[PDB]
Design a protein around this ligand. Structure first.
Ligand code: RLP
Ligand code: RLP
Ligand code: RLP
Ligand code: RLP
Ligand code: RLP
Ligand code: RLP
Ligand code: RLP
Ligand code: RLP
Lengths: 154, 154, 154, 154, 154, 154, 154
């Protein structure tokens, strides 16, 4: 059987992070987590490109530019959506997720999903460096794995 | 670390706004907000192109023409959807959001989302220049930021 | 500020209407409304092309052929979906709306939405020439406006 | 009448399996089922290529690379999604399913769906080698059939 | 400020794992997770020493022998306790935790805690490779970090 | 990977059993079970040393003397605690468990836990040779395994 | 370890099917499933012998004659029992199952159980080619496996 997998050592890997500003008090913890994950797995901070955008809505178009860079191995999308009173959350969460996934397939490059989609503020806090971990760290670890996988698969 | 971000000064930037006429008593406040945000951030009103369309459904096709203009740096979509008795709202909100996001990615140009998607009239009023701000102003500010970001990122 | 908008006079405009047969007792009222709107706004009935299809499912593929005609300025989609006992309604409504919107963007030509998506028969009747107007007339009026807009915008 | 169908003998067929690691205690049972199905229907284990990825989110991009291999007849996607507290499940499940289906159509190659999408842990266990069978085995059997079908249809 | 921390690359590190057999259907998933975490972080499987013992009660005495080995950098304790009808669970969980912690301090060597202490079988399953991750993987990662930390701190 | 484990053949192994007299009608069944387990796994009854003590409180001090014997490979602690009206049970159970575990670590010799800690008489009966097995037999089997393990590990 | 198992390719295998007529509208679907399973796994339809009998009661005596044929490798029993108002169902289901199992052991030949034993008509429909699969297909697949197994085991 031929088996392909990615290790979790990040030496030499180069990452793009796109991070929105809405709910920044939480997003900033996700960004801290993603960078820490990369660095302590052996990636160099210098090899990270961070792009800031206003909201989750704007993440895909920026991620599309980063993922097109030949010197970026994977893109990590970071944001925090918390349901409000209206269905706005639904439409943004749907389009952010669809856009990122579509871009990944179009560009044949891993784009990982570190966007919290929470019904409540409590759920978002839980996932931004408290009881349920740090979604930024999770999405970064995924990106490390996928970038290494792609070194043999792509 | 390489860091890219957009400032909020709008000198020299050129914006397209596509604004629907359905629920105009609310949309017109969103348009006022977007224009004010551009102008007081340093953008010239002469550098704004405003396109009116009948309803939210029609926003994407018009935005597609504006976004294709080489002299437009970002497009701001402005509309107001309020849920009625039938699921019509769902289908329009889904397609307007999907279309705009898809166009942004296809054209590699920022298109911001100033479309209210409210369950009630009260929620729409709240977001069109009253207690929960002005979604037109928010979408304009996002567009300023994204246009500035793209000056280095694109 | 540059301002683009469409007037509501339809002199010289040429329209395609795609109308499904399912629920025809209602769809036929929508078609009457669309034609009346065009004619009394100055459009010639001879400049209308009407295509009939079995159900809402089949509207997009027919609309795609009409919208590709260089001598059609806009397409008006007309149908009536009424929720039944199963989720079938959801999947048809989702695809008819997605298809039309996608075609509009792909062909850079206005395609308006005169498809009722009702939970009940009563709601459909309300929107097919009774208390809540006539969705065919609304979609036709939109098409008039968009065709005029596109005369300067496209 | 011309009739095309796929037999279930897997002699000479070559398969790609993409299996995520999230919920591995269940996914690993699905992988065991898929491999067993192939082998006991006559396929050689040496003709299987297994790609591991972090989560269901990452399955499509990896499946896209495998499906593009001329010496892969079909791809089997294997993962386990279990609903949590937030709507995150919905967005991942929607994009994994959409991506795989889109890739299948784009590449004109069968990609089968062995991804459990469960509301509860119990439901996932039921479908990963207990009372409701093994979704990996089902997706592999489907892939066998489709690969054979395509030998005359493609 | 002097700052000491451990990276997550496991090259050259040597680990002891002590894993009980009670509830093995769950423990065995924790062992899989720990080994995977070591290997994909760069540790060699040949540098792992695995000791099996009957129950959680027996973990400390075995861990004491492994931790005393000069060529073991950290020990990972792996077990699954599920509360029964009597308070037995309390006394075992208390003593296994106390013993491991005491040994770590006595021997000035990291000993990490991969012992699930669940009120229910469902909670144990959740933590042994399903919705709440894999406690073996978590304890292994901790051990990697602590072994690296100790390379400068000890 | 280096793997250490204990087999369940007891040829040549020498055991100490410390058994309390309180609740003897149950403890005596546990002692029967422990002896049977040893003998039918190949241990000689002559190689068992049995020490009787008044209550569970007194088990540790006796176990400490037995575990210090160079010709004892493992000690099996056997007793029955049943909750009464006062918290006395808690303090005895806590100390008997802590003492045994501490002695095991101090003397680097396996001491297994065959002490029932029951809330009710029914629970104790269940665990002393009826529906939930025989805790003496379990603790003896553990001791066999640990003594064998220690033949290579210690 | 010596391991014996049956593959699922049916080339050269010869099968007997005994199918009752009571509840034929469902049994006939089970028979379709059994034949399809055999044929698409490589068995020849000419190598199938189908015996029809009145009711489940009569399946064993007919299966006894088929299983005694040296040129039959396995027998598949197919029927549908649905509980009525009286305990009649219980006695028939008990004897059909006992008879078939007894005959299998007596003749040292696989006889598989494709007899639905349902409390309700809905449950029977579910298992005769709808949501819970096709019991005829399942029993045929079992027979394939057992016939192959017996080629080395018998
Ligand atoms: O309309 C609002 O501002 C409240 C709803 C909202 N919620 C969030 C959220 O929870 N998380 C988030 O990242 N972004 C959000 N955006 C902003 C949009 O993403 C977008 O920036 C604007 O609509 C302008 O395009 C939102 O508009
Ligand atoms: O059918 C109706 O008119 C009521 C539902 C409705 N609601 C809204 C709304 O709340 N906001 C909005 O901007 N537009 C709407 N359009 C119109 C469609 O957008 C479209 O103009 C027509 O269907 C014609 O294409 C609507 O049709
Ligand atoms: O955010 C979480 O980690 C909990 C939700 C979650 N649940 C599942 C699940 O049930 N099954 C699964 O296969 N994957 C999951 N991923 C991970 C994503 O798929 C993805 O790996 C990450 O978002 C990083 O891209 C998840 O993020
Ligand atoms: O997981 C299951 O098998 C039960 C759910 C299910 N239900 C249906 C159904 O009701 N109708 C249907 O036509 N197919 C189904 N498929 C199978 C999938 O379509 C597909 O074949 C498999 O996921 C393998 O790719 C299903 O998987
Ligand atoms: O008495 C019982 O066997 C049931 C309670 C029990 N539960 C667990 C458990 O949930 N997990 C576990 O790892 N071990 C257990 N041990 C066994 C003890 O740990 C020990 O092996 C015996 O008491 C013999 O020393 C247990 O005795
Ligand atoms: O098992 C879990 O991860 C959830 C419970 C838990 N909760 C916390 C917590 O709330 N705070 C905290 O500081 N640590 C925790 N650790 C981790 C352990 O401390 C330890 O790191 C691991 O068990 C590995 O040794 C935990 O394991
Ligand atoms: O007595 C009745 O006819 C109703 C009960 C009944 N139910 C079933 C059934 O649900 N399925 C089935 O296969 N057969 C049945 N037979 C008939 C007996 O099997 C038998 O044919 C007669 O008793 C005559 O021997 C039954 O008699
Ligand atoms: O009809 C079904 O498949 C569901 C019921 C069922 N449940 C089990 C089960 O829980 N465990 C099990 O080992 N087998 C089962 N078999 C299959 C039969 O044993 C037999 O294989 C078939 O009836 C074919 O002969 C079953 O048919």
């Amino acid at each position: 059987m031929q088996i392909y997998e990615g290790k979790l050592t990040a030496e030499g890997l180069r990452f793009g992070i796109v991070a929105s500003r809405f709910n920044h008090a939480l997003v900033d913890r996700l960004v801290e987590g993603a960078i820490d994950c990369i660095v302590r797995h052996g990636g160099r901070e210098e090899d990270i490109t961070l792009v800031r955008v206003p909201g989750s809505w704007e993440i895909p178009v920026a991620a599309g530019e980063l993922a097109r860079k030949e010197d970026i191995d994977a893109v990590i999308a970071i944001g925090v959506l918390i349901r409000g009173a209206t269905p706005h959350f639904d439409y943004i969460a749907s389009e952010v997720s669809k856009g990122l996934a579509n871009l990944s397939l179009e560009l044949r490059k891993p784009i990982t999903f570190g966007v919290i989609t929470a019904d409540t503020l409590e759920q978002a806090i839980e996932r931004a460096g408290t009881k349920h971990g740090n979604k930024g760290w999770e999405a970064a670890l995924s990106a490390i794995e996928m970038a290494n996988l792609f070194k043999s698969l792509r």
